[PDB]
């Protein structure tokens, strides 16, 4: 098997997915489905599917086209807000774990108020007082300090209360501060929002409390380009710090397509990539609804695979991935008629790289991510998943596993394709065409006997007896596994009333039983052999017949004509053998008939078997 | 023989490629039959799959059989130690730890080695990398050489870009190029190197002594057969500024 342990648990999920719309159940989470194995690994990937769930857990249009949905300003802007969610509960947690030494021990003795927690998270990241702090303290801590990491952690409430205790020193920050948490959207009115930004950047855009020029240009989404890195020193602190500061419809401000091509264009890989590791970058790609990037530079990560494959299932199961149309483009693309801010994927092409790793000895698995791409067609109008069944039946030739596999005694044992689709018609014509092109007739008649079409099935069984004919029938010979295999197909295409067009089909069953005349021939029994050939009508015994059986070797198949020579001399033979032992008179009539027949007959090695025809008939006299 | 493993598949196919580059071209038709058996491994250069937790808890709850791909084997207390012993050592799956065990007891080195069976596992191991990377740079080395006929020169090229690149030929045509595999490739040969050391050197500050040396010296030849094929693809212009820049990095922060 060439599935990891995380793989192959994803891949029973990604099955049971199948299984739920296979039989038109209810059409179940994946983002669910797949966190459901993250938590067997590290927590590095539990904390990623909480960011894919919650960035996708978003009010969506159903029945909406991907690229409409990831343009509206009304979708791109709840994916700030989910964003700024994730990494105010992300820093919440931060400061659990700081506090206590495991989530479990702060969970034993009771989560305390974020305000609580807060100013028990003060107490260690600032044990001493820094001189530069401004309006004084609130029950032991700096002001400013309380209402940054309230906010960081996302309660607003827990930061006005602290607001509310030092009304006095706070000035008119409290009549602002009470309307950022009323408004949505974490935005003030023009008014008042003029009002603060211009007296902040009146005498305090160098202000020796980093706290308090934080909160200001949080709250008025000013001075965008200082980081405020006194206080943001980790990346998701930059993160959050910005997506409060992105702005919607011209100085000092900026926006989201703004923010997030300027990040990656400016900022890429290799600025993000420096302390080799690889989430940090995901995050700020995913965090910013960079779907796409995010999920191919995951997807390079040889140890990240599985994962960035899933989080771009999800994102396509949600009509929230953006496909790229031509399946000739590379994995990531911006379309030329499309804006340069956003990105799309290839995602077939991404699907079928993931699948070339474990398709050769897991086809089961490889089927259950092949199905996803069921909607998807080619430039020649195959059907994606149906073509990806043909190309891994013709290299993994698991024909009994994945096809079903006809018995010989009329069964048809469902293959794991059947699941999918019922029109099985197709392919298995498919992986038998190719089969037939390759000179492989033995396979391509099991395969479309598979498919019950006789016109072929009765056509390559033409070819592989007019060899064998003559033969001799021997244990395991190549006559013997032939023949058993014609006579299993006689009995279940008369048993089940088959037939192909009766030009194919006559020559199947004379054929069948020539092979009968030669195996009769061949063990001596003369008399038994003679009357067969005789039931046939295809050499004449009596004179009066010449004219019309010469006319039918005309419009015979050249899979007969071809052993039209064996069929003499044996005949020949036959009443040769009988001769040695009036009865002369008509084996005599007959011999001459045989010699006549082959003279108007012009066929193979027609030389040297007239000859020894006349040769045979002379002894006889 | 005909059935061959997968270390005697590339042991042999190595040979044929010394007899090409040797002007011996007594095995065309044969040389060619092997580069379709293993296409899965040109692709992916080095890749050991994750120890995970599943056939962990399976492989030592139920020791007694084992199946895999179509065959079928039973396990013992003594063959299922080694699996674990394997399989933590190199940080390796139990079933593809298992597998090259396998292959041990089937041809039998036990005996032409004299060695404990789970340290064959080991070489085994170190011996598929060696010829899956040492036989690449004889296809780029032949594929170069002008002192051969063109035609032939010119089959081993078109097929190197597709079999080792991964770029398919003219006539036809989500996957990850070439040198971001390479680079994560040479990456893992060096923080298995280091781990190495330091799991190597506490137990050592025995009969494994040459064991280890040899392994040092296959690693160290994996790595420059990698150089060498970086080399050769950065020769047909398939670079960019990205890798550049990512080499420039790394050198400055060579110690």
Same mark, same amino acid.
């Given at each position: 098997?060439?599935?990891?342990?995380?793989?192959?648990?994803?891949?029973?999920?990604?099955?049971?997915?199948?299984?739920?719309?296979?039989?038109?159940?209810?059409?179940?989470?994946?983002?669910?489905?797949?966190?459901?194995?993250?938590?067997?690994?590290?927590?590095?990937?539990?904390?990623?599917?909480?960011?894919?769930?919650?960035?996708?857990?978003?009010?969506?249009?159903?029945?909406?086209?991907?690229?409409?949905?990831?343009?509206?300003?009304?979708?791109?802007?709840?994916?700030?807000?989910?964003?700024?969610?994730?990494?105010?509960?992300?820093?919440?947690?931060?400061?659990?774990?700081?506090?206590?030494?495991?989530?479990?021990?702060?969970?034993?003795?009771?989560?305390?108020?974020?305000?609580?927690?807060?100013?028990?998270?003060?107490?260690?990241?600032?044990?001493?007082?820094?001189?530069?702090?401004?309006?004084?303290?609130?029950?032991?801590?700096?002001?400013?300090?309380?209402?940054?990491?309230?906010?960081?952690?996302?309660?607003?409430?827990?930061?006005?209360?602290?607001?509310?205790?030092?009304?006095?020193?706070?000035?008119?920050?409290?009549?602002?501060?009470?309307?950022?948490?009323?408004?949505?959207?974490?935005?003030?009115?023009?008014?008042?929002?003029?009002?603060?930004?211009?007296?902040?950047?009146?005498?305090?855009?160098?202000?020796?409390?980093?706290?308090?020029?934080?909160?200001?240009?949080?709250?008025?989404?000013?001075?965008?380009?200082?980081?405020?890195?006194?206080?943001?020193?980790?990346?998701?602190?930059?993160?959050?710090?910005?997506?409060?500061?992105?702005?919607? *419809? @011209?100085?000092?401000? !900026?926006?989201?397509?703004? =923010?997030?091509?300027?990040?990656?264009?400016?900022? &890429? $890989?290799?600025? #993000?990539?420096?302390?080799?590791?690889?989430?940090?970058?995901?995050?700020?790609?995913?965090?910013?609804?960079?779907?796409?990037?995010?999920?191919?530079?995951?997807?390079?990560?040889?140890?990240?695979?599985?994962?960035?494959?899933?989080?771009?299932?999800?994102?396509?199961?949600?009509?929230?991935?953006?496909?790229?149309?031509?399946?000739?483009?590379?994995?990531?693309?911006?379309?030329?008629?499309?804006?340069?801010?956003?990105?799309?994927?290839?995602?077939?092409?991404?699907?079928?790289?993931?699948?070339?790793?474990?398709?050769?000895? *897991? @086809?089961?698995?490889? !089927?259950?991510?092949?199905? =996803?791409?069921?909607?998807?067609?080619?430039?020649? &109008? $195959?059907?994606? #998943?149906?073509?990806?069944?043909?190309?891994?039946?013709?290299?993994?030739?698991?024909?009994?596993?994945?096809?079903?596999?006809?018995?010989?005694?009329?069964?048809?044992?469902?293959?794991?394709?059947?699941?999918?689709?019922?029109?099985?018609?197709?392919?298995?014509?498919?992986?038998?065409?190719?089969?037939?092109?390759?000179?492989?007739?033995?396979?391509?008649?099991?395969?479309?006997?598979?498919?019950?079409?006789?016109?072929?099935?009765?056509?390559?069984?033409?070819?592989?007896?007019?060899?064998?004919?003559?033969?001799?029938?021997?244990?395991?010979?190549?006559?013997?596994?032939?023949?058993?295999?014609?006579?299993?197909?006689?009995?279940?295409?008369?048993?089940?009333?088959?037939?192909?067009?009766?030009?194919?089909?006559?020559?199947?069953?004379?054929?069948?039983?020539?092979?009968?005349?030669?195996?009769?021939?061949?063990?001596?029994?003369?008399?038994?052999?003679?009357?067969?050939?005789?039931?046939?009508?295809?050499?004449?015994?009596?004179?009066?017949?010449?004219?019309?059986?010469?006319?039918?070797?005309?419009?015979?198949?050249?899979?007969?004509?071809?052993?039209?020579?064996?069929?003499?001399?044996?005949?020949?033979?036959?009443?040769?053998?009988?001769?040695?032992?009036?009865?002369?008179?008509?084996?005599?009539?007959?011999?001459?008939?045989?010699?006549?027949?082959?003279?108007?007959?012009?066929?193979?090695?027609?030389?040297?078997?007239?000859?020894?025809?006349?040769?045979?008939?002379?002894?006889?006299? | 023989?005909?059935?061959?493993?997968?270390?005697?598949?590339?042991?042999?196919?190595?040979?044929?490629?010394?007899?090409?580059?040797?002007?011996?071209?007594?095995?065309?038709?044969?040389?060619?039959?092997?580069?379709?058996?293993?296409?899965?491994?040109?692709?992916?250069?080095?890749?050991?799959?994750?120890?995970?937790?599943?056939?962990?808890?399976?492989?030592?709850?139920?020791?007694?059989?084992?199946?895999?791909?179509?065959?079928?084997?039973?396990?013992?207390?003594?063959?299922?130690?080694?699996?674990?012993?394997?399989?933590?050592?190199?940080?390796?799956?139990?079933?593809?730890?298992?597998?090259?065990?396998?292959?041990?007891?089937?041809?039998?080195?036990?005996?032409?080695?004299?060695?404990?069976?789970?340290?064959?596992?080991?070489?085994?191991?170190?011996?598929?990398?060696?010829?899956?990377?040492?036989?690449?740079?004889?296809?780029?080395?032949?594929?170069?050489?002008?002192?051969?006929?063109?035609?032939?020169?010119?089959?081993?090229?078109?097929?190197?870009?597709?079999?080792?690149?991964?770029?398919?030929?003219?006539?036809?045509?989500?996957?990850?190029?070439?040198?971001?595999?390479?680079?994560?490739?040479?990456?893992?040969?060096?923080?298995?190197?280091?781990?190495?050391?330091?799991?190597?050197?506490?137990?050592?500050?025995?009969?494994?002594?040459?064991?280890?040396?040899?392994?040092?010296?296959?690693?160290?030849?994996?790595?420059?057969?990698?150089?060498?094929?970086?080399?050769?693809?950065?020769?047909?212009?398939?670079?960019?500024?990205?890798?550049?820049?990512?080499?420039?990095?790394?050198?400055?922060?060579?110690?």
């Amino acid at each position: 098997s060439s599935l990891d342990n995380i793989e192959m648990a994803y891949a029973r999920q990604i099955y049971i997915y199948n299984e739920k719309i296979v039989n038109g159940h209810l059409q179940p989470n994946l983002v669910d489905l797949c966190a459901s194995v993250a938590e067997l690994d590290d927590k590095s990937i539990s904390d990623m599917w909480t960011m894919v769930k919650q960035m996708t857990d978003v009010l969506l249009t159903p029945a909406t086209d991907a690229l409409k949905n990831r343009s509206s300003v009304e979708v791109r802007m709840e994916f700030v807000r989910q964003a700024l969610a994730y990494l105010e509960q992300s820093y919440k947690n931060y400061t659990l774990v700081t506090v206590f030494g495991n989530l479990h021990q702060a969970q034993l003795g009771g989560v305390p108020g974020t305000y609580q927690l807060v100013r028990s998270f003060l107490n260690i990241k600032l044990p001493a007082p820094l001189p530069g702090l401004q309006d004084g303290e609130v029950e032991g801590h700096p002001v400013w300090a309380l209402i940054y990491y309230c906010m960081r952690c996302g309660d607003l409430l827990a930061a006005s209360q602290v607001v509310n205790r030092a009304q006095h020193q706070l000035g008119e920050f409290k009549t602002w501060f009470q309307e950022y948490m009323n408004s949505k959207d974490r935005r003030l009115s023009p008014a008042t929002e003029n009002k603060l930004r211009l007296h902040y950047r009146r005498a305090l855009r160098n202000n020796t409390d980093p706290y308090k020029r934080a909160v200001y240009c949080i709250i008025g989404r000013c001075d965008v380009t200082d980081n405020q890195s006194e206080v943001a020193d980790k990346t998701e602190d930059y993160l959050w710090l910005k997506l409060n500061q992105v702005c919607f *419809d @011209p100085q000092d401000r !900026l926006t989201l397509s703004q =923010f997030q091509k300027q990040l990656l264009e400016d900022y &890429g $890989e290799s600025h #993000f990539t420096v302390n080799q590791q690889p989430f940090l970058y995901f995050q700020v790609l995913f965090l910013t609804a960079q779907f796409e990037a995010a999920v191919a530079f995951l997807f390079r990560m040889e140890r990240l695979r599985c994962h960035a494959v899933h989080v771009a299932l999800v994102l396509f199961e949600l009509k929230l991935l953006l496909k790229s149309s031509g399946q000739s483009a590379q994995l990531l693309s911006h379309e030329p008629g499309d804006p340069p801010c956003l990105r799309r994927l290839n995602f077939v092409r991404l699907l079928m790289l993931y699948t070339r790793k474990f398709e050769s000895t *897991d @086809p089961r698995e490889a !089927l259950q991510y092949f199905y =996803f791409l069921r909607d998807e067609k080619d430039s020649q &109008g $195959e059907n994606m #998943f149906l073509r990806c069944v043909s190309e891994l039946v013709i290299e993994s030739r698991e024909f009994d596993m994945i096809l079903g596999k006809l018995e010989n005694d009329g069964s048809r044992k469902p293959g794991v394709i059947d699941k999918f689709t019922s029109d099985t018609k197709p392919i298995i014509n498919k992986v038998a065409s190719v089969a037939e092109n390759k000179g492989l007739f033995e396979e391509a008649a099991k395969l479309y006997d598979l498919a019950k079409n006789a016109d072929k099935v009765l056509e390559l069984m033409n070819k592989l007896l007019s060899p064998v004919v003559p033969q001799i029938s021997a244990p395991q010979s190549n006559k013997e596994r032939l023949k058993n295999m014609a006579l299993s197909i006689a009995e279940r295409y008369r048993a089940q009333g088959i037939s192909a067009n009766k030009f194919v089909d006559s020559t199947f069953y004379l054929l069948l039983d020539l092979i009968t005349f030669f195996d009769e021939y061949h063990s001596g029994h003369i008399d038994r052999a003679f009357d067969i050939i005789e039931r046939l009508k295809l050499v004449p015994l009596n004179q009066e017949s010449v004219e019309e059986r010469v006319a039918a070797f005309r419009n015979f198949s050249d899979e007969i004509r071809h052993n039209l020579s064996e069929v003499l001399l044996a005949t020949m033979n036959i009443l040769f053998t009988q001769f040695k032992r009036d009865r002369d008179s008509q084996l005599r009539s007959q011999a001459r008939t045989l010699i006549t027949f082959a003279g108007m007959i012009p066929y193979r090695t027609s030389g040297d078997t007239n000859a020894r025809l006349v040769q045979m008939e002379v002894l006889m006299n | 023989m005909t059935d061959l493993r997968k270390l005697e598949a590339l042991q042999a196919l190595h040979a044929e490629l010394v007899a090409v580059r040797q002007h011996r071209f007594e095995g065309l038709q044969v040389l060619e039959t092997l580069l379709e058996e293993q296409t899965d491994a040109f692709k992916a250069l080095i890749a050991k799959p994750a120890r995970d937790t599943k056939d962990r808890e399976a492989l030592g709850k139920e020791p007694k059989k084992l199946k895999i791909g179509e065959e079928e084997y039973s396990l013992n207390e003594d063959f299922v130690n080694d699996c674990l012993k394997l399989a933590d050592e190199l940080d390796l799956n139990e079933k593809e730890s298992a597998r090259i065990l396998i292959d041990c007891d089937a041809e039998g080195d036990v005996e032409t080695q004299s060695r404990p069976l789970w340290e064959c596992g080991v070489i085994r191991f170190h011996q598929e990398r060696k010829y899956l990377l040492d036989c690449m740079r004889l296809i780029l080395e032949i594929a170069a050489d002008e002192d051969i006929d063109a035609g032939l020169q010119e089959s081993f090229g078109v097929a190197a870009e597709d079999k080792i690149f991964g770029i398919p030929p003219p006539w036809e045509r989500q996957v990850k190029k070439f040198i971001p595999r390479c680079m994560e490739a040479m990456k893992g040969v060096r923080s298995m190197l280091q781990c190495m050391a330091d799991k190597a050197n506490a137990r050592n500050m025995l009969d494994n002594q040459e064991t280890l040396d040899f392994s040092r010296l296959s690693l160290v030849e994996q790595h420059e057969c990698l150089a060498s094929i970086l080399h050769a693809a950065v020769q047909r212009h398939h670079a960019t500024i990205a890798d550049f820049q990512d080499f420039i990095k790394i050198l400055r922060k060579w110690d």
